Structure formats: C-alpha cells, structure tokens
Design an enzyme around this catalytic site. Structure first.
Site, PDB file in Angstrom:
ATOM      1  N   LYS A   1       8.024  -4.927  -3.027  1.00 54.00           N
ATOM      2  CA  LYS A   1       8.318  -6.085  -2.514  1.00 54.00           C
ATOM      3  C   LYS A   1       8.003  -7.655  -3.125  1.00 54.00           C
ATOM      4  CE  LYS A   1       3.769  -6.598   0.446  1.00 54.00           C
ATOM      5  NZ  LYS A   1       4.190  -7.634  -0.089  1.00 54.00           N
ATOM      6  N   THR A   2       6.428  -8.093  -3.489  1.00 57.75           N
ATOM      7  CA  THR A   2       6.879  -8.199  -3.936  1.00 57.75           C
ATOM      8  C   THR A   2       8.218  -9.383  -4.642  1.00 57.75           C
ATOM      9  OG1 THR A   2       4.688  -9.282  -3.278  1.00 57.75           O
ATOM     10  CG2 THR A   2       5.315 -10.197  -4.908  1.00 57.75           C
TER      11      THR A   2
ATOM     12  N   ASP B   1       6.275 -11.752   5.050  1.00 55.07           N
ATOM     13  CA  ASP B   1       5.681 -11.023   4.501  1.00 55.07           C
ATOM     14  C   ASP B   1       4.830 -10.386   4.864  1.00 55.07           C
ATOM     15  OD1 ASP B   1       5.463  -8.783   2.376  1.00 55.07           O
ATOM     16  OD2 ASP B   1       3.956 -10.079   0.887  1.00 55.07           O
ATOM     17  N   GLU B   2       4.352  -8.767   5.378  1.00 57.22           N
ATOM     18  CA  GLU B   2       3.687  -8.607   5.894  1.00 57.22           C
ATOM     19  C   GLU B   2       3.623  -8.691   7.244  1.00 57.22           C
ATOM     20  OE1 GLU B   2       0.721  -6.827   3.932  1.00 57.22           O
ATOM     21  OE2 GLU B   2       2.466  -7.681   2.493  1.00 57.22           O
TER      22      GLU B   2
ATOM     23  N   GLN C   1       1.359   0.571   7.129  1.00 60.53           N
ATOM     24  CA  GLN C   1      -0.228  -0.191   6.784  1.00 60.53           C
ATOM     25  C   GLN C   1      -0.475  -0.933   7.626  1.00 60.53           C
ATOM     26  OE1 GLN C   1      -0.478  -0.943   2.548  1.00 60.53           O
ATOM     27  NE2 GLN C   1       2.393  -0.728   2.676  1.00 60.53           N
TER      28      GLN C   1
ATOM     29  N   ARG D   1      -3.539   3.139  -2.781  1.00 59.75           N
ATOM     30  CA  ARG D   1      -4.559   2.624  -3.684  1.00 59.75           C
ATOM     31  C   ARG D   1      -4.104   2.990  -5.035  1.00 59.75           C
ATOM     32  NH1 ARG D   1      -2.983   0.683  -0.361  1.00 59.75           N
ATOM     33  NH2 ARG D   1      -1.762  -0.423  -1.492  1.00 59.75           N
TER      34      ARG D   1
END
Ligand SMILES: [Hg+2]
Ligand SMILES: [Hg+2]
Ligand SMILES: [Hg+2]
Length: 649
Positions: free
Chosen positions: A34-35, A219-220, A250, A601
């Site tokens: 995503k970044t 973001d987030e 998340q 992760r």
DNA sequence: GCAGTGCTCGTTTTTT
DNA sequence: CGAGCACTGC
C-alpha cells in the site's frame, strides 16, 4: 513519464496509481504494498495530472510512517519536493494551530500536554475540587475527557440529564479546560478539535485550505476516530478529491477510539467513490496466506477479500504445546538457535505476545541462552522522568504560566518549597483564578507565606527569570546544557544511587545531543520548535542499536513489520481472547483481527505455541488452545510435540 | 519530604 | 504471586 511510474507496479496497483482524480478507497490487503501505491500515486498526481506539490496532503498516524513516506516520496522523485504537507493528524493539526494561533484563541507559544502531564493535571484539579480521588480516579477522568474530544464535545455540550455521576465529570472537564486554557496548554485530543473548530469558525481560513489542498491521501483509515473523519470530510468539502487507503481487517485500536465504520462511512458519504482491492501479497508463503485467509473469514463485519501469492506454499505452520510457560520459552529459543546456526539473523526473528505480562519469562530464557534481543515495550525517551524535569524548566522559560511545568519542578530538586506552601499556592490559584506562577507572585508580595519558605519560592522564580534572560542568545544545546546544570537536576541525578542513577545522567547527556543534532527548518524559534518536537515525537528507548537481536513486542506493536521467522506465544483461550472478550462482548472479532495481523507478519515461517499450564498471577491455571489455532486449515498446520520415550537400555 | 511498610489486585493494548 | 503504591512516624 507514464511508464516510469506504472511498469514496476502490478495490475491492480496500477489501477490505483493511475485512476482519475477522485475519491476512492484503496482496500490494501496485508502484504500488498500500500505504501508503494501511496508514494507512486503522489508522484503520479504531480507528473501526470500535473498537480502542484502544494496541493498534496498525505496524512498518517505514526511519525515512523510519516517519515517513511516523506523519505520514499523523495527517492522516487527528484529532490525535496517541498510545499507538500506530509504528516500525522496531530502533527498537521499542530501546524495549523501555530499558523493561525490567534484565530484559534491560542497564545503565540501554547505548549502541548503529553499523557503524564495531562494525567497529573487532572489529579491536582480533582483534589482542588475536594473530590475523592479514591472514587473519582484521574485515569478515569482522562478517559472521559479524551473520549469526549474525539467527538468534538466541549463541556457545554455534555448532556448529563440527571446522573451527577456524569454531571460531575462534566464539572471536572470544565475545570480542566478552564485551567489548560489559562496556562496555554493543549493536549493531544485538543490539537485535533481546536483545529477542526478553527475551520468551522473561520471561513476564509477554511477557504484558503480547500483552495490549496485538493489532493488528500489518508493511510490506515480504519484507525481514524470521529473527529478525524470529520476533519477530513470538512477539508475535502466539495472540491478536494481524497484517496483513503485501509484494511477494515487490521483495525485493532477500537478500544481507544478507532471507528470500524469510517472505512464504509467513506463510501456512503461519497457516491462515485470506487473501491480498488490490492490482494497480491509479496510478503508471505502460500500456507501463511491460506491460514491467514481462513482465520479472518470467521468474522462477520468484513468488506471481504482474499490474500493470494505467486510464491510457493512454503513450510507449513508449526503448532506447539509445551508443559508450562517456561517450556514454551525454551522451545522458541531453540528454534531460533537453529535459525542462527544456519546463518539466520536474530533480527529476522520476532516473538509476539498479547500481553506485556508475557515478556518476563521470554527474556530470562533468552538471557540464559546468551541470545541478544530487543524489547519494544514502553518508556519513550521524551517521557522518561529526568527528561521531563529538564523540559519543564525550559518550558518555564518559554512561558511562566505553564502550570504543568511549574507543578513538576518547583520543588524538584528539593529547594525548600514544601507542601504547606504549595497547598496555599494551589488554592489561591483556584479562588483567584490565576496560574500557579501568578499566584506565587501575589502571595509573595502579600507576604502570606512563611518567611524561610517564601524566601525559597522567591529564589526559584528568580532562577527561572535569570535563566530566561541569560540564555536568550544561546544555541539550543547550550541553553539546554545550562538549564540542566543551573536547575540543579544534574547534581541531583549525579548523586542518585547505582546503575539507575547512571542511566538517568547518560540520558540527560543524550538530551543535550538530541538538542545539538536538532535540525531547525521555519515558523517558530528553536526552543519552542524543539519542545513541540519532544511532545509529538516519543523518540524510542536508546542505544544497543547494532547488535543482531531477536525482536520482542506485543502483537499491537508488530503491525506493519515483517519477519522471516515469527513466533506467536500464549495462544490459549483465557489469554487470547481473554477476559472481556469472554464474559460477553464482541471485541472478539477485534481479537481475531489482532490474530490475523500477527499471522500476516510472517514471511517464511510461523510458529504458534501455547502451554497446558501457566502460573497466571497467583495460582496455576490450565488453559486450552485458542479457538484461533483451530480455525486455521489442517493442511497448512503442523503440530510439534515432545513425548516421553522410555527406552529400556 | 522520605524511608519503610502493609495492601492492593491484575488495564490485554500504544499513538500522539 | 509480586510490581506498584497508597500510608504513616520521624
Ligand atoms: Hg490538481
Ligand atoms: Hg503439552
Ligand atoms: Hg495450506
């Protein structure tokens, strides 16, 4: 160049990077990059849609993030790329309040309040109101007041209909603000609300920003609260086009104000807003994503999606049942030793746990094995006591009305200003509605304090005034060094017992260095500029940075990280999920999301473990395996175990 | 104020 | 079970 920005990106990432200017929701799967989309998107808006860097405002939640983004934007791009606001809600909010402090009803150099500061202030106010701190906890007050602001609710909005239980808190809250506002203090929550309100009351200012920032990227988004969603909405208005990136799966910060809704709310309050799903994962092996996929489906809210990969299935997921919590530790350590003895790095191993409680046992086990490691628990640099004491002196130099800074170091180190003196002072501030300092001035004048004490209180005020002058024309790290000595702090911590005393001095040494290396920039003078920095940037927990160490942390602070080897401990019902999520609730789904995060992760291998017995604060208990472990596919899993094989020699 | 002592009861969790 | 911590007596 159109190809320069799209070629390395995949089919659905391009969809996002190259979409037309508009409002859209990029639902980023776990290891979807995503970044990379956010960065590439921004460079696209500048190169292709030809937008001015001044038209872009990317907002994140953590500074780490803000930095990673500011960094990556630069390399994909030519140079600095200034004119572009990149930062966090609080950071950007703080920026606005400085630029328009006057229109915001804030003084030139208002100061920010970190948790502690805020917590202490409530304590002083609850007592000064003659309330039972025993049945009116500051900690409780804090939660009430923060929760209130995360909704834009001021004291005169509280609708406590009849229960003084609430009518009372409103009282506290009203006093807290009255005080804060009188001293020039602003807490984290205030920063957002004051900003927000700023736009509400000053049309030209709001107009000026709707005109500048037409490109908003957030973001987030699944971790935003009501006021942040609101702040974005108000700014986007009718013109701005905003791209929000997020994963409704998340979201694990709901217990502090995160709104699971917001991610959908966006879609609702925005017709035309399309949704691009990023589901290719370039992180984990197929088994991991399988188990990951499987697990998360058990929740019902979800907007839906399936993480998939081009890579091989990889090793299966190892499960382990240990005797007690102490065996579970040795198990994890030995798997790691193997990893290491095969050339694996320690820093590519991470041990995750639900509760900070679970770290103790792990460390001894690691230490006993002489295995280097690093824990990511608490105590940030600018939150250590030796640092706050120092800062409170600098704080007093900027503004004598900083009650929080005053109350903290007036008699720290001890200089004879006792409790009978301070009790008179704190009451005078209430009755004559003055800032601590102001009150100490009238009392001194009035000679209402005991001569010797008064004489001490005086000498203090003179010291601060003396430092505020003598240190006006000095470099930040010179003025800091001087305040740290003249305050008497160095002398105090210099003569503090053993190892801890050492540590506190080495930190004060680090505070000077931090000041030395502090890179200016701009808007305000260095001392204020620096105080803002120390209040908004916790700043890690020091050195030991080069050692290849194993990584330990809670699942919450592992969000965004990736490790080839990931060890999740304490996988048992009664611990994960635990209390609350048991005796009726639904924070359960949040708990499965936390689980989901932990799982996603892992890059190469995942090992989940639990014990048949652990000594949970008090007696021995017998927890059974988390239902989560049972919700993973049987094919992706592989159970390890030790059996007592008694062989007659 | 500060050194000791007797008493909690366990916040899942971390940002700013 | 014990880290953290409200309580006094000097
Ligand atoms: Hg534009
Ligand atoms: Hg076992
Ligand atoms: Hg599988």
């Amino acid at each position: 160049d159109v190809s320069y920005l799209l070629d390395s990106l995949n089919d659905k990432q391009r969809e996002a990077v190259a979409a037309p200017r508009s409002n859209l929701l990029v639902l980023a799967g776990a290891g979807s990059g995503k970044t990379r989309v956010l960065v590439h998107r921004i460079a696209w808006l500048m190169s292709v849609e030809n937008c001015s860097p001044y038209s872009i405002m990317a907002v994140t939640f953590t500074n780490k993030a803000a930095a990673e983004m500011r960094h990556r934007i630069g390399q994909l791009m030519g140079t600095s790329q200034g004119g572009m606001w990149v930062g966090t809600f609080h950071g950007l909010a703080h920026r606005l309040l400085r630029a328009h402090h006057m229109d915001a009803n804030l003084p030139q150099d208002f100061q920010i309040l970190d948790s502690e500061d805020q917590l202490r202030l409530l304590k002083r106010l609850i007592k000064a109101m003659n309330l039972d701190e025993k049945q009116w906890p500051p900690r409780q007050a804090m939660w009430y007041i923060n929760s209130q602001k995360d909704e834009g609710l001021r004291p005169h909005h509280i609708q406590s209909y009849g229960n003084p239980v609430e009518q009372t808190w409103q009282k506290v809250y009203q006093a807290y603000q009255e005080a804060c506002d009188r001293a020039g203090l602003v807490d984290f929550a205030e920063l957002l609300l004051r900003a927000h309100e700023l736009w509400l009351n000053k049309p030209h200012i709001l107009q000026h920003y709707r005109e500048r920032f037409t490109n908003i990227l957030v973001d987030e988004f699944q971790d935003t609260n009501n006021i942040q969603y609101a702040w974005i909405r108000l700014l986007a208005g009718d013109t701005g086009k905003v791209m929000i990136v997020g994963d409704d799966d998340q979201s694990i910060y709901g217990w502090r104000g995160a709104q699971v809704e917001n991610i959908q709310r966006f879609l609702n309050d925005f017709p035309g807003a399309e949704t691009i799903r990023l589901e290719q994962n370039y992180r984990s092996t197929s088994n991991i994503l399988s188990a990951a996929n499987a697990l998360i489906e058990n929740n019902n809210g979800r907007l839906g999606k399936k993480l998939w990969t081009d890579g091989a299935d990889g090793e299966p997921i190892s499960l382990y049942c240990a005797f007690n919590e102490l065996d579970e530790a040795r198990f994890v350590v030995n798997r790691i030793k193997t990893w290491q003895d095969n050339g694996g790095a320690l820093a590519e191993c991470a041990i995750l746990y639900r509760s900070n409680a679970q770290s103790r046992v792990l460390e001894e086990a690691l230490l006993q094995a002489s295995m280097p490691y690093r824990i990511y628990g608490g105590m940030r640099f600018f939150e250590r006591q030796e640092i706050k004491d120092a800062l409170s002196y600098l704080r007093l130099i900027v503004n004598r009305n900083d009650d929080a800074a005053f109350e903290r170091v007036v008699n720290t180190p001890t200089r004879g200003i006792g409790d009978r003196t301070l009790d008179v002072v704190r009451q005078t501030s209430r009755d004559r509605q003055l800032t601590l300092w102001q009150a100490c001035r009238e009392l001194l004048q009035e000679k209402a304090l005991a001569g010797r004490a008064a004489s001490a209180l005086q000498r203090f005020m003179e010291l601060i005034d003396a430092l505020a002058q003598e240190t006006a024309d000095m470099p930040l790290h010179v003025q800091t060094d001087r305040v740290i000595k003249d305050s008497g702090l160095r002398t105090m911590y210099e003569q503090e017992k053993g190892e801890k005393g050492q540590t506190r001095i080495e930190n004060l040494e680090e505070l000077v260095t931090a000041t030395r290396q502090f890179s200016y920039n701009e808007d305000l003078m260095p001392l204020q500029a620096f105080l803002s920095h120390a209040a908004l940037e916790a700043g890690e927990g020091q050195a030991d940075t080069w050692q290849d160490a194993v990584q330990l942390m809670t699942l919450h602070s592992a969000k965004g990280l990736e490790f080839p080897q990931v060890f999740i401990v304490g996988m048992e019902e009664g611990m994960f999920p635990s209390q609350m999520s048991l005796d009726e609730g639904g924070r359960l789904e949040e708990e499965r999301r936390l689980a989901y995060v932990g799982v996603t992760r892992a890059m190469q291998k995942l090992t989940l473990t639990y014990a048949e017995t652990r000594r949970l604060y008090g007696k021995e208990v017998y927890h059974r395996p988390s239902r989560f472990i049972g919700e993973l596919p049987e094919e992706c899993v592989e159970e390890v175990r030790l059996r007592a094989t008694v062989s007659r020699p």
